[PDB]
Paper text:
In North America, half of [name]-related fALS cases arise from mutation of Ala4 to Val, with one of the most severe forms of fALS with the shortest survival time. Ebselen is an organo-selenium compound that scavenges reactive oxygen species and enhances cellular defence from oxidative damage. A new higher diffracting form of small molecule-bound [name] [name] crystals has been established allowing us to visualise ligand pose of the compounds targeting cys111 in the pathogenic target enabling lead optimisation through structure-based approaches. We elucidated binding modes of compounds at the dimer interface of [name] mutant by high resolution crystal structures which are beneficial for describing structure-activity relationship.
The copper- and zinc-containing [name] ([name]) possesses four cysteine residues. The active and stable [name] is a homodimer stabilised by an intramolecular disulphide bond between cys57 and cys146 and metal sites bridged by histidine residues that are loaded with Cu and Zn. [name] possesses two additional free cysteine residues cys6 and cys111, is mostly distributed in cytoplasm and is responsible for converting toxic reactive superoxide into oxygen and hydrogen peroxide preventing oxidative stress within the cells. Extensive efforts have established that it is not the functional loss of SOD's enzymatic activity that is responsible for the ALS causing properties, but destabilisation of dimer caused by mutations or loss of metals in the metal site that leads to aggregation properties which are the disease causing agents.
Numbering used by the authors:
A (entry chain AAA), B (entry chain BBB): 1 to 153
The structure:
């Protein structure tokens, strides 16, 4: 019943389209789409705080963390709202994304509209990496592609 | 107090950065920035309904019009929320944008976050073109660049 979309763009080309749908404001968000141009394996997948792509993906700032928690994986209670874990690219460099998440929302103070979706260079260690960066960024490395999360029809 | 930003990109040379600031939710929104790569003269400048760039600036849909009005200019009572008139490009193809608008907002029903800002091929006739299309689009022609309006620091 609310529909949101993000077009991911970066050098490669790394490029993707991610759709978000929420039936009800108290319900989960379905996240689906595809990303191409990736290296085979895990890629950290996060909502970042700012929908600011003026200087590319760096402008997006840190993970979206409205509740001031540590970084974790999507299944963790201790996570940032923006912690969507990893997407997985096949040998052809395509990640087919299929996520259901209870913590992001398309309304209220967990709302992700106007924020940035980022796909990262490396795996997100989901806060289990055992260094200070693990519980902040998950050590997922550079930002390969991003886009501002927008309202869809 | 609320800051939002939009990076305009398209299929051609046109690129720009637009900033929006709103001190108070009941106050005007200051709009400032720059668009480069334009032909000299007037170019329509609108907030479109969808923050959807799936197939480029076409996917942004029609002018943002939550109050079901006809198309006009920004100083008109009869306007779409998204009707920000024209920007003007100089001999070098640079439009220095400086708008203050009382109808757009960065909160509430007129909120433009997660919508698309579009700069057009031709002048917007501000609903004074003398044909039916004038009262819908202002006859501003194709979409040269666009971007989703995102939350800034
Ligand atoms: Se959603 C979303 C995204 C960006 C900015 C504001 C919101 C929003 O809906 N806020 C809100 C609406 C109603 C009640 C609380 C918060
Ligand atoms: Se602002 C904003 C941006 C994106 C989606 C929703 C909103 C929003 O705050 N909606 C809203 C809140 C309160 C009253 C009307 C509308
Ligand atoms: Cl990061
Ligand atoms: Cl149009
Ligand atoms: Zn995080
Ligand atoms: Zn209009």
């Amino acid at each position: 019943a609310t529909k949101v979309v993000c077009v991911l763009k970066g050098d490669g080309p790394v490029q993707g389209i991610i759709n978000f749908e929420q039936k009800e404001s108290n319900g989960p968000v379905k996240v689906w789409g595809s990303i191409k141009g990736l290296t085979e394996g895990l890629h950290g997948f996060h909502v970042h705080e700012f929908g600011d792509n003026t200087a590319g993906c760096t402008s997006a700032g840190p993970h979206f963390n409205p509740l001031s928690r540590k970084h974790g994986g999507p299944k963790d209670e201790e996570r940032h709202v923006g912690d969507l874990g990893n997407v997985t690219a096949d040998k052809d460099g395509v990640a087919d994304v299929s996520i259901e998440d209870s913590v992001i929302s398309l309304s209220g103070d967990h709302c992700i509209i106007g924020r940035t979706l980022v796909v990262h260079e490396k795996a997100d260690d989901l806060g289990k990496g055992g260094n200070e960066e693990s519980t902040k960024t998950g050590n997922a490395g550079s930002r390969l592609a991003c886009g501002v999360i927008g309202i869809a029809q």
